[PDB]
PDB file of C-alpha atoms in Angstrom:
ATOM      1  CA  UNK A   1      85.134  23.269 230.887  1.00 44.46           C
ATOM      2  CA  UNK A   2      85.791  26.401 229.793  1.00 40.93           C
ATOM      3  CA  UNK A   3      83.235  29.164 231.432  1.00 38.01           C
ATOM      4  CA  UNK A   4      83.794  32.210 234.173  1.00 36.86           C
ATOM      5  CA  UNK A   5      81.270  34.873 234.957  1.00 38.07           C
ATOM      6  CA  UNK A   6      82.373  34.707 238.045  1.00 35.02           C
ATOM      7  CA  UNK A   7      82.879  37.417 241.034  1.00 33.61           C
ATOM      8  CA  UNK A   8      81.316  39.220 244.116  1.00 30.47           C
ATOM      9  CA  UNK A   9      78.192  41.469 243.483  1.00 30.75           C
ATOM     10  CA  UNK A  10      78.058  44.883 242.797  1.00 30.03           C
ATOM     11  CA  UNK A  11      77.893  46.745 246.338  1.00 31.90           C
ATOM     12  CA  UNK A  12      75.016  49.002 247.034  1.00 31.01           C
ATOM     13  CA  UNK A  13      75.710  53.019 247.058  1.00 30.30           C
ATOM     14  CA  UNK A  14      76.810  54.267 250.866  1.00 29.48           C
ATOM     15  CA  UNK A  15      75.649  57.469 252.276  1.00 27.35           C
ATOM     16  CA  UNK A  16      78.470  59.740 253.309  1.00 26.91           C
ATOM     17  CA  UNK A  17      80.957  57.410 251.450  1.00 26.80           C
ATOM     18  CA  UNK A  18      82.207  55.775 248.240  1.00 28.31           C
ATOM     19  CA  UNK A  19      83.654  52.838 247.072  1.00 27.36           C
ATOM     20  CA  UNK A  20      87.451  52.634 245.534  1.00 27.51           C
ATOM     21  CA  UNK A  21      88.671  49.710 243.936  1.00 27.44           C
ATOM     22  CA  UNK A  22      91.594  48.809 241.573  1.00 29.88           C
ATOM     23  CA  UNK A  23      89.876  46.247 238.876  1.00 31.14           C
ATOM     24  CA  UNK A  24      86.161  47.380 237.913  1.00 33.78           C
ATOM     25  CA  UNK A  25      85.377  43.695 237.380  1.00 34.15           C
ATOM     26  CA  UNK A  26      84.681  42.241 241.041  1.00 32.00           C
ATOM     27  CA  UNK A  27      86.670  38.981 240.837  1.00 31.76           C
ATOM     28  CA  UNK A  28      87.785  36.527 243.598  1.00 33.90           C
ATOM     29  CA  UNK A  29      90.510  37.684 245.893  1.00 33.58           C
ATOM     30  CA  UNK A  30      89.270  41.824 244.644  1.00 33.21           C
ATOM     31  CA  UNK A  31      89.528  44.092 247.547  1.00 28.58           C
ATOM     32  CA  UNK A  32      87.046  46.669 248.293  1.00 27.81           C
ATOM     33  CA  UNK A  33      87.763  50.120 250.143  1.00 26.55           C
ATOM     34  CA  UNK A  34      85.017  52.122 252.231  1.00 27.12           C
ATOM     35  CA  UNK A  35      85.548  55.643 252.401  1.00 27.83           C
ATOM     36  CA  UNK A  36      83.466  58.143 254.692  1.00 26.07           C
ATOM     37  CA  UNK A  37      83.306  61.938 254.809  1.00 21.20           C
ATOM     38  CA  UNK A  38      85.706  63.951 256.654  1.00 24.55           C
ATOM     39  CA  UNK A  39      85.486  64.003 260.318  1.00 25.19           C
ATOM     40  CA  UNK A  40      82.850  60.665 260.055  1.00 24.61           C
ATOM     41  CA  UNK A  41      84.128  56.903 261.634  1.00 26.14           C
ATOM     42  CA  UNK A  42      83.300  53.978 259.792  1.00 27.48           C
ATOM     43  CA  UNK A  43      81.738  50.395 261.401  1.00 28.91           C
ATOM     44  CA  UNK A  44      82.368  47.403 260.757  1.00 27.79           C
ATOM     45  CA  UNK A  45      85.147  46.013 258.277  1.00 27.27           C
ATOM     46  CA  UNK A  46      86.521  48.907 256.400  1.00 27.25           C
ATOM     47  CA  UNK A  47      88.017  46.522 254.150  1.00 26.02           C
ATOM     48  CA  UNK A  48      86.098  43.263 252.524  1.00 27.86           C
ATOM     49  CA  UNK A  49      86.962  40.868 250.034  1.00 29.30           C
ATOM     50  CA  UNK A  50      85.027  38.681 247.796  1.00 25.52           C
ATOM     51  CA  UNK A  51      85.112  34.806 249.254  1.00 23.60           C
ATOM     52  CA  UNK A  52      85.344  31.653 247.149  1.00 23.07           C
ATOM     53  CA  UNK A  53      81.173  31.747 247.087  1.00 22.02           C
ATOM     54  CA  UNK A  54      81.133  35.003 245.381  1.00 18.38           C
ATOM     55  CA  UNK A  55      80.445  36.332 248.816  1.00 16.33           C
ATOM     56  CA  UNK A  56      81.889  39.211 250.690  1.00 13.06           C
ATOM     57  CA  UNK A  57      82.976  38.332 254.101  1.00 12.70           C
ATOM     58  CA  UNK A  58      80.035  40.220 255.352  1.00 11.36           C
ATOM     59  CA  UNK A  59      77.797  42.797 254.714  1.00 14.73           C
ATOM     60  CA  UNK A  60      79.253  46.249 253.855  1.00 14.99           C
ATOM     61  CA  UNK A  61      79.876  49.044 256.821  1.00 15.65           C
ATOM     62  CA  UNK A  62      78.548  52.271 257.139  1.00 16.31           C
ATOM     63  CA  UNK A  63      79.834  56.208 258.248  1.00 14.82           C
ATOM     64  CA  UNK A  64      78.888  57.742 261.829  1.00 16.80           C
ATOM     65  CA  UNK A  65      79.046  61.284 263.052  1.00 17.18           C
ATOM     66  CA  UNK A  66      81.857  61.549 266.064  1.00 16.21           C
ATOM     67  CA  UNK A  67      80.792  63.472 268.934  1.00 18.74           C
ATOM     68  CA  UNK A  68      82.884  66.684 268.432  1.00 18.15           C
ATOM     69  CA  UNK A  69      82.430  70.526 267.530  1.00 17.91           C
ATOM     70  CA  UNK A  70      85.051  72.727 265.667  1.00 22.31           C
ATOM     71  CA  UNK A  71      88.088  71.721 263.797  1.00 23.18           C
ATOM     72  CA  UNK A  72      90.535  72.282 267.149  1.00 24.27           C
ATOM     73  CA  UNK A  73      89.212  71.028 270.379  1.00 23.15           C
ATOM     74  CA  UNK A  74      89.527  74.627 271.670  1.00 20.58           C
TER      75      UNK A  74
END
């Protein structure tokens, strides 16, 4: 019994964000990382990894504008 082609599937494209991950090939135990823009917050589980069932955890998060104006408070 000699057979893989295993591992998690390929996540769909986020708005405001992208995707950074060590190994290209999604394999059990991988660990995905959700980046957002600059000065967006993230919800959800900023980190997932890919379960025994070729699953992630749970579906992927998204960005979300903070309520604030200018770089310094002011």
């Amino acid at each position: 019994g000699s057979s893989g082609s295993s591992g998690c599937s390929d996540l769909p494209e986020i708005q405001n964000g992208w995707k950074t991950t060590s190994h290209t090939e999604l394999v059990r135990g991988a660990r995905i990382t959700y980046q957002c823009d600059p000065g967006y917050d993230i919800v959800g589980s900023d980190t997932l990894t890919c379960q025994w069932d070729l699953s992630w955890s749970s579906d992927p998060p998204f960005c979300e504008k903070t309520e604030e104006s200018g770089p310094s408070s002011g």
